[PDB]
Design a binder for this molecule. Structure first.
Ligand SMILES: C=C1C(=O)O[C@H]2C[C@@H](C)[C@@H]3[C@@H](OC(C)=O)C[C@H](O)[C@@]3(C)[C@@H](OC(C)=O)[C@H]12
Length: 130
């Protein structure tokens, strides 16, 4: 019985999924994000990728017999630049922010139950303490 693992596979595959997001290929969800006075922004993505990084997106998208193709979802209580970074995190495993924003990001991550960014931003904030 021959067996093989490519330990770099998930990383390569995500690199391509993020390219597909950036060229807007295969996308099946458009996140329309309106936050108070921010201009509206919209982000296209793949449901299965969002679902695999956030229990909130997974529950959002897993509903028996559902839409065919492009669902537009309205997103309210989060700033576009925060949603942007959570999407990136989901597609890349990485997130960056101006130390001013660590808190708004932690807020976004809590709402989408992105566990690992929640720790990340809590440890930062706490480290930032005397
Ligand atoms: C870095 C950005 C981010 O990731 O989310 C933005 C949050 C948004 C509410 C922010 C607003 O904050 C105030 C004081 O109204 C004004 C501010 O211009 C803002 C749009 C961005 O800048 C910072 C440092 O907070 C934030």
């Amino acid at each position: 019985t021959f067996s093989y693992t490519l330990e770099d596979h998930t990383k390569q595959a995500f690199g391509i999924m993020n390219e597909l997001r950036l060229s807007q290929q295969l996308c099946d969800v458009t996140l329309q994000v309106k936050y108070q006075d921010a201009p509206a922004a919209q982000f296209m993505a793949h449901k299965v990728v969002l679902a695999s990084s956030s229990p909130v997106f997974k529950a959002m998208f897993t509903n028996g017999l559902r839409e065919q193709g492009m669902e537009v979802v309205s997103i309210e209580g989060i700033h576009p630049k925060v949603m942007e970074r959570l999407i990136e995190f989901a597609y890349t495993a990485s997130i960056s922010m101006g130390e001013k924003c660590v808190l708004h990001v932690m807020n976004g991550a809590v709402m989408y139950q992105i566990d690992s960014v929640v720790r990340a931003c809590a440890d930062f904030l706490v480290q930032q303490l005397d």
